[PDB]
Amino acid sequence: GTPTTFVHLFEWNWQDVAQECEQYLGPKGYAAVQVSPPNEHITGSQWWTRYQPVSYELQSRGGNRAQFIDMVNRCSAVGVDIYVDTLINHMAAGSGTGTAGNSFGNKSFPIYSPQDFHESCTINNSDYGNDRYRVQNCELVGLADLDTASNYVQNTIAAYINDLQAIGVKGFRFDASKHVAASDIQSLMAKVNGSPVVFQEVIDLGGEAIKSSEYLSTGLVTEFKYGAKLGTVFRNGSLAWLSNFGEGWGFMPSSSAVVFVDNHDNQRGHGSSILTFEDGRLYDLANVFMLAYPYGYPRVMSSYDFHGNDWAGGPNVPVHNNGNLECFASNWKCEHRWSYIAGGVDFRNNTADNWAVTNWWDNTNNQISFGRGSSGHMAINKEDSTLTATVQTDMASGQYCNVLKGELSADAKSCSGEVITVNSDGTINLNIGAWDAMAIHKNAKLL
Ligand SMILES: [Ca+2]
Ligand SMILES: [Cl-]
Ligand SMILES: [Cl-]
């Protein structure tokens, strides 16, 4: 197979990430980990402190510089890249202290002076619809707005990015990219070595002054329409409608899009329509669709139970806790380990040679099935009945692991879970319980 999917290990520290790469992400074929911001940020326990930078020293809640490097190396040894959440728009609000011991205040930081910032003003709600200048030059919730047109600012951010590349970081999330002119991002990328993966966070559901399409020339772009519409369909619509999901629904080009069911902001209600781990099996099924369907570069969300406090930081117990995995309950949720989601990743990994949707079938409502040509086939039953339709595939006849429920043995003789039969004529006689699914692919076939 080939790498197709990455994961946000939200608020995971560098030792937990490194261990997770070795024990799970490498073996299961995840391509990369998006880590929380690793630069110096304001002190305090809330998750949102990570988005208030104080400097570019690599001392953060996740760990120190040596720990960060050890993580990059341990993950890369098992084939997993690191993408860094990169704060290109701003520095912390107000005054205080950072996680490396530095002080700041009055738009004075270890590496920035007041002249390195746009003149202070406030982004007001109306500005998103009618004032691009203010969205991009004024302050987002009090954060000091860097003058991203300045050569010094561009050189300082680029030096941060290039230091990360020199220690092995392979990609970058440009936080708050809507708040930075795409032209400024273009000037920054000219100072960045090489061609790392770059994706830009731009929330654009339509109807505002700045469009996500403005950022296509400078890197990948978050397609927030994807999760918003997918959530609405899974909650209130029909899965049959998804037969032409993608550009036909008004989305950006597939080859530019980072897609996801939810992210750290919008799982806190910051779309009521967004699906999250709180939705249980409905979330499972949405992720199976996303990962089987050939649109975009998907990012699986990996969350913690925040017990109703949308500002709280993560659990005070590590993920890997002296031999106990603190997953699936009221600490870390570890969605990337949920069987249907990890199985979806394996499916995407092994269908990457055929980015077509073939033999689409539905019952006009909430039962669907489709193929990736002869590389794979899937079905979802999001109804209260058993799905027993006979569907056409392009798969070679034989017996296949349902990779949502099990894995092929090292000897290729058996599956650890359900086995699916492709008939002589390429059909499958489905037998899918209510709110269940199946996926098979050409590299999980019994020999
Ligand atoms: Ca700005
Ligand atoms: Cl450092
Ligand atoms: Cl994002």
Residue numbers in the entry: 0 to 269, 272 to 448
Paper passage:
The α-amylase from the psychrophilic bacterium Pseudoalteromonas haloplanktis (AHA) is probably the most thoroughly studied cold-adapted enzyme that shows such an anomalous T-optimum, which, in this case, is about 15°C lower than the melting temperature (Tm). Earlier computer simulations of the catalytic reactions of AHA and PPA, based on molecular dynamics (MD) free energy calculations using the empirical valence bond (EVB) method, could directly reproduce the T-optimum of AHA and explain its origin. It was found that a particular binding interaction, between Asp264 of the enzyme and the 2′- and 3′-hydroxyl groups at the −1 position of the oligosaccharide substrate, starts to break precisely at room temperature. In particular, the final model (Chimera 4) that combines 16 mutations in all of the four identified regions above is predicted to almost entirely recover the stable hydrogen bond interaction between Asp264 and the substrate at 25°C, as opposed to the wild-type (WT) enzyme.
To structurally evaluate our computational design, we determined the crystal structures of Chimera 4 in its apo form and in complex with the inhibitor acarbose. For example, both PPA and Chimera 4 have a well-defined water position that bridges between the carbonyl oxygens of Asn265 and Gly273, and this water molecule would clash with the AHA backbone.
